[PDB]
Amino acid sequence: ELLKPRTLADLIRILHELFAGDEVNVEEVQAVLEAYESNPAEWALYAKFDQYRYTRNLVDQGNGKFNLMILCWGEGHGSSIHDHTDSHCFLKLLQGNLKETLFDWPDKKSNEMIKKSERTLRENQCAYINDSIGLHRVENVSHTEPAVSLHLYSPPFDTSHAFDQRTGHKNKVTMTFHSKFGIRTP
Numbered sequence: 796e797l798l799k800p801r802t803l804a805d806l807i808r809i810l811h812e813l814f815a816g817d818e819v820n821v822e823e824v825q826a827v828l829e830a831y832e833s834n835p836a837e838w839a840l841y842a843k844f845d846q847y848r849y850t851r852n853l854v855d856q857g858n859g860k861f862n863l864m865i866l867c868w869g870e871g872h873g874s875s876i877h878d879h880t881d882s883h884c885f886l887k888l889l890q891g892n893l894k895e896t897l898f899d900w901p902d903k904k905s906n907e908m909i910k911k912s913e914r915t916l917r918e919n920q921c922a923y924i925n926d927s928i929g930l931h932r933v934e935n936v937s938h939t940e941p942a943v944s945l946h947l948y949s950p951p952f953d954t955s956h957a958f959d960q961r962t963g964h965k966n967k968v969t970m971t972f973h974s975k976f977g978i979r980t981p
């Protein structure tokens with residue numbers, strides 16, 4: 796029984812219910828994330844920006860099966876082309892817009908990675924990706940507005956690959972947290 800989350804705290808409680816089991820109802824999780832109306836006062840604690848790149852800010856450690864975090868994208872900040880390490884990955888916009896570009900998994904032969912498609916993710920929308928869908932790059936192309944997004948991963952993961960757009964060659968990257976539960980973790 797999916798009800799509208801009243802607050803971020805309410806959302807988190809509902810997510811603990813949705814991940815109480817071993818499997819994941821993707822459409823239900825996405826629906827609930829989209830139904831939470833972003834309220835900046837509730838997540839200001841986690842919205843810690845860096846001038847030079849986007850930051851990842853742990854919000855909830857989950858129940859063993861998922862992590863919830865907030866990413867803060869300065870004007871012009873973007874990601875690598877990357878994968879999600881066999882996890883579900885939900886992305887909900889809390890503030891601003893992000894551009895998502897989809898790429899196919901490369902073949903072993905060195906080749907330019909060509910965009911499959913692209914879309915604009917707008918405030919309060921929730922997108923979903925997994926490795927079966929493809930790879931992606933996420934970017935704040937705004938010159939004037941910072942973006943903030945809410946990310947849910949299940950299972951949690953702390954490494955992934957970055958892909959060279961020119962060749963499709965990949966390398967493993969360790970994921971770090973800029974803060975945890977509102978506390979800066981240098």
Ligand SMILES: [Fe+2]
Pocket residue numbers: 877878879884931933
């Ligand atoms: Fe991603």
